[PDB]
């Protein structure tokens, strides 16, 4: 295989290894809720500002509830993918070898029950992130443009 500076470099491997989807030294549920709150803070912006009620004083709650609904749909999709692909007592399929070659313990994140914890965490985190973006966009809302 080819190894360009993109796919192989100190800083890029460092960054990708630091984000929650690969730091196996944390419980999978916590990585799930972290990515969930990340995407929750993420999606509220355009959905609210450019929604079909933007010219209305309700556009805030509208966009936020829409974001929450999308988060719920995607959590449903996550659970469905997990129950489809992950069996309930069978082993894991996560990369158990690092770059050097340290034989890694099978990532509990890549297990049926682990994927379930991940899904629940992601859903709760998305809800929290959406409501937090709402409370920070329509109460304490001076230094922004919207």
């Amino acid at each position: 295989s080819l190894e360009t500076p993109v796919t192989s470099s100190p800083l890029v491997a460092w960054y990708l290894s630091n984000l929650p989807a690969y730091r196996t030294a944390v419980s999978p549920l916590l990585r799930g809720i972290e990515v969930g709150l990340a995407h929750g803070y993420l999606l509220v912006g355009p959905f609210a500002l450019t929604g079909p009620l933007r010219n209305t004083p309700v556009h805030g709650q509208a966009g936020t509830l829409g974001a929450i609904g999308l988060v719920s749909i995607l959590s449903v999709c996550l659970t469905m993918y997990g129950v489809a692909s992950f069996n309930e007592g069978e082993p894991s399929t996560a990369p158990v070898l690092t770059l050097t070659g340290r034989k890694k313990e099978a990532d509990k994140l890549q297990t049926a029950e682990g994927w379930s914890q991940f899904t629940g965490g992601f859903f709760f985190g998305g809800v929290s992130g959406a409501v937090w973006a709402y409370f920070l966009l329509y109460v304490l809302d001076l230094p922004y443009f919207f």
């Binding site: 749909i73 449903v76 469905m80 129950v83 489809a84």
Partner: peptide, 30 residues
């Protein structure tokens, strides 16, 4: 009135549950 109750249900949630049920089915492996 009654349309506001039913049309959204037969448009989004009932198709959603049908799709996810058939997904689960076709992905079965006994």
């Amino acid at each position: 009135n009654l349309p506001s109750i039913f049309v959204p249900l037969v448009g989004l949630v009932f198709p959603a549950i049908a799709m996810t049920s058939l997904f689960l089915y076709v992905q079965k492996k006994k």
